[PDB]
């Protein structure tokens, strides 16, 4: 019956900042059977707060929770670089003992530049019937980026897919990869392929290209 | 909440014997956050076992603990004269970190008989406006006893108070005293007062009485 | 050496307030949980409250919620127990212990007495005699505890049984001391119980003669 | 040592049935509630069901009522989740968690995939370098997951294995890359190790310049 909504969906703060994660309900809470979780990628969720305001055993002092009326707040007093992950609230006094949609915590960092690379399709894939061109963006910040595919010089659309990694623990940056998938025939209709990368941390659009396509 | 109930209420053993004290919970135990304490009257409580089976620093090896299912047991292998006290178990995993009600570990001896005495109220108190009759039990074992007041052989209740001493450091016996208190007006209203004593060392309820109105 | 010293507390009326202090030394104070434990007359040990090392989490037994507050000052190495709206059933010996689990280090304990009764000296009455002989003294209607009792200025110490005091409905304590002697010293020896009540500065010496 | 090991997960067609099992050890299984929690791809955590320690009470999320059944065998330390009439939206990673309140102990999870597509092994293609970067293109496999390592686990710095992308054909494809200095263009051999257990596919592909 009672549903939980976490605000905001994404939150970007610098290390050492004060994080205020909200978890609101459709109606005012009538119990303290609330919890908070931290889900780092690659690991199972970790209980942080139980009983709405009690730390789980082994939880550092900077994590604290409280509840009042319809607002269930988890507070991270001083954000350390490791305290960046996905955070879910949960009710567990009555079924359904549901979670919120979650809130992502992003590390703020100085803007970095994407070292752009490009890869042609292998002859082993060409004889299979398809061709895939890969454009690589390695270590860049922030997440916002625009990658376009330029077969010869006509812009291509509706034939590529992008995949973003998560924030590295060391570099606190990202990494993007777009894959241009076209049939063997359309890889023969043209000869030149290039990906133009326009980034806020880039003084000008960088274009890494390759030829010999046929 | 989980409620701890200790068993037995009173444990009567002799020095050198094997002591087993229980501590059962409302539901099945799910952790080892359990402790045993020793407490002597007028002295500071003392931890004996923490973590369900770890001896606190300095505790002699004759103290050992274990937990299984719904029973939490304290074991004294051979009873030392310094071991007869009150024992409490405790849970401390989370709030409330409550204790048990306590187990009295007394010394076991042969059954003794209470030499019952009785005292009429002194005339000094009668001039104040009240009267109190006393019934004495001296040097007996075990601690269990029951006395009754019957004014004119009519069962009296709700107007008496009893007091028991500690186990003697030599005789290993107890001593009881019951004090019946009623108004000065209700004292001369009757004439026969008595206290009946029921004990194991008695073949029949003895009654040392007086008849001074 | 771990040192725990409870202070504060004493005699108070129902609805009164008392602030207990547990001055600690010999260990890093702000690194440990702290716990308050009490024990009342003729009852068992009762866990009252505890507090986290940084004081950000406090937990209480149900009977003291809304009335007692546990707090700490880590710069002063002091643990506190603010007791408001005290009740007669709060009369107990209050201990402070270190940690939140198996309590190893206890304090000596301070005594808190909550009662609407006032200070009153005892009225000593004799229990005249009438195998051997039994005689005694009835120490009645005094407040607060305790009363010391001796016989013949402390010369008769063998065979004497001084009971523990009982709390009457009026709020006053009543005490009875007894002693057994042979009938040979019944008329020859005179027995006088020495009653002392310091909180009222009352010293009574009454002789018990056989009637 | 609390141990929760899920099993019984795999690839099933829409409408098919699947039985998940959670073997437990390190605690008295009959003393605790138990809970099932799932998480879909790029979705949040979803509570599915829980059961009382004696099996006298079971609760479910509305989406699975009538189709899923949670049960337990307190004598065998095993927890079960019978899934019948599986829809496509039931595809997720299913986790076993002890208790019914604050979930402290979690299992590692088993993947349940509901789709009509058949199990297909991946095609590993090289990414020729021309500092310098090189990688491997793991294309067209089903179902998840795929694990990629470089030089049998020797190159653990600078590697970025991108998450998988669902293609129009319904098959998955990913890519794993790593940056290297041009001084090691030929003196050091670079081989990506791709493993796809759902189809028992293991590929060791050496990446050479073109």
């Amino acid at each position: 019956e009672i549903v939980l909504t976490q605000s905001p969906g994404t939150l970007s703060l610098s290390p050492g900042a004060r994080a205020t994660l909200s978890c609101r309900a459709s109606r005012t809470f009538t119990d303290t059977y609330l919890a908070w979780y931290q889900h780092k990628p690659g690991q199972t969720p970790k209980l942080l707060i139980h009983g709405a305001s009690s730390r789980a055993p082994g939880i550092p002092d900077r994590f604290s929770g409280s509840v009042s009326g319809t607002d269930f707040v988890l507070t991270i007093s001083r954000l350390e670089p490791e305290d960046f992950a996905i955070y879910y609230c949960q009710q567990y006094g009555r079924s359904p003992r549901s979670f919120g949609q979650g809130t992502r915590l992003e590390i703020k960092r100085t803007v970095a530049a994407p070292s752009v690379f490009i890869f042609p399709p292998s002859d082993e894939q060409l004889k299979s019937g398809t061709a895939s061109v890969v454009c690589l963006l390695n270590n860049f910040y922030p997440r916002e980026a625009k990658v376009q595919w330029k077969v010869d010089n006509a812009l291509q659309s509706g034939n590529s897919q992008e995949s973003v990694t998560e924030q590295d623990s060391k570099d606190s940056t990202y990494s993007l990869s777009s894959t241009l998938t076209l049939s063997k025939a359309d890889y023969e209709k043209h000869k030149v392929y290039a990906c133009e990368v326009t980034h806020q941390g880039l003084s000008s659009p960088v274009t890494k290209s390759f030829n010999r396509g046929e | 909440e989980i409620v701890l109930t200790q068993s037995p209420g009173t444990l009567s053993l002799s020095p050198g014997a094997r002591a087993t004290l229980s501590c059962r919970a409302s539901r099945t135990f799910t952790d080892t956050y359990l402790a045993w304490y020793q407490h002597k009257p007028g002295q500071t409580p003392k931890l004996l076992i923490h973590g369900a089976s770890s001896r606190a620093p300095g505790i002699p090896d004759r103290f050992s603990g274990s937990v299984s299912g719904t029973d939490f047991v304290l074991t004294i292998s051979r009873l030392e004269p310094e071991d007869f006290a009150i024992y409490y178990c405790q849970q401390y995993g989370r709030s409330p970190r409550s204790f048990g009600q306590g187990t009295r570990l007394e010394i076991k001896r042969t059954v003794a008989a209470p030499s019952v005495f009785i005292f009429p109220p002194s005339d000094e108190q009668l001039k104040s406006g009240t009267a109190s009759v006393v019934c004495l039990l001296n040097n007996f074992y075990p601690r269990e006893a029951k006395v009754q007041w019957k004014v004119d052989n009519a069962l009296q209740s709700g107007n008496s108070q009893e007091s028991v001493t500690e186990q003697d450091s030599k005789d290993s016996t107890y001593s009881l005293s019951s004090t019946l208190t009623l108004s000065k007006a209700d004292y001369e209203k009757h004439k026969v007062y008595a206290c009946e004593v029921t004990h194991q060392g008695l073949s029949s309820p003895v009654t040392k009485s007086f008849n001074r109105g | 050496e771990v040192q725990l010293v409870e202070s504060g507390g004493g005699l108070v009326q129902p609805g009164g307030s008392l602030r207990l202090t547990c001055a600690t030394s010999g260990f890093t104070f702000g690194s440990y949980w702290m716990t308050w434990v009490r024990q009342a007359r003729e009852k068992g040990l009762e866990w009252v409250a505890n507090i986290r090392h940084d004081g950000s989490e406090t937990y209480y037994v149900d009977s003291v919620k809304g009335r007692f507050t546990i707090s700490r000052d880590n710069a002063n190495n002091s643990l506190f127990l603010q007791m408001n709206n005290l009740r007669a059933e709060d009369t107990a010996m209050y201990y402070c212990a270190r940690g939140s689990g198996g309590l190893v280090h206890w304090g000596h304990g301070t005594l808190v007495t909550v009662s609407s009764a006032s200070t009153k000296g005892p009225s000593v009455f004799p229990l005249a005699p009438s195998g051997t002989a039994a005689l005694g003294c009835l120490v009645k209607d005094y407040f607060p505890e305790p009363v010391t009792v001796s016989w013949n200025s402390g010369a008769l110490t063998s065979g004497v049984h001084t009971f523990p005091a009982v709390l009457q409905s009026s709020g006053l304590y009543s005490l009875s001391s007894v002693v057994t002697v042979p009938s040979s010293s019944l008329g020859t020896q005179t027995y006088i119980c020495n009653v002392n009540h310091k909180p009222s500065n009352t010293k009574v010496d009454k002789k018990v003669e056989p009637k | 040592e609390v141990q929760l090991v899920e099993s019984g997960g795999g690839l099933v067609q829409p409408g098919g049935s699947l039985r998940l099992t959670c073997a437990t050890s390190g605690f008295t299984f009959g003393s605790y509630w138990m809970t099932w929690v799932r998480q879909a791809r790029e979705k949040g955590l979803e509570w599915v069901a829980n059961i009382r320690h004696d099996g006298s009470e079971t609760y479910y999320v509305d989406s699975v009522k009538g189709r899923f059944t949670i049960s337990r065998d307190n004598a065998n330390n095993s927890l079960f989740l019978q899934m019948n009439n599986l829809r496509a939206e039931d595809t997720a990673m299913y986790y076993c968690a002890r208790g019914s309140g604050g979930l402290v102990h979690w299992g590692h999870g088993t993947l349940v995939t509901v789709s009509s597509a058949s199990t297909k092994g991946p095609s590993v293609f090289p990414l020729a370098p021309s500092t310098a970067a090189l990688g491997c293109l793991v294309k067209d496999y089903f179902p998840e997951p795929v694990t990629v390592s470089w030089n049998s686990g020797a190159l653990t710095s600078g590697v970025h294995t991108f998450p998988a992308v669902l293609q129009s054909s319904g098959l998955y494809s990913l890519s794993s890359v790593v940056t290297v200095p041009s001084s090691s263009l030929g003196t050091q051999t670079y081989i990506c190790n791709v493993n796809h257990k759902p189809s028992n596919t293991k590929v060791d592909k050496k990446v050479e310049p073109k």
Binding site: Y33, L47, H50 | Y33 | W33, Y59, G102 | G102
Partner: peptide, 17 residues
């Protein structure tokens, strides 16, 4: 060892009302 934190109540019955 003496600092036992507030452990989790993992067996929460269903609440009604």
């Amino acid at each position: 060892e003496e600092n036992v934190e507030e452990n989790v109540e993992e067996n929460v019955e269903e609440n009604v009302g």
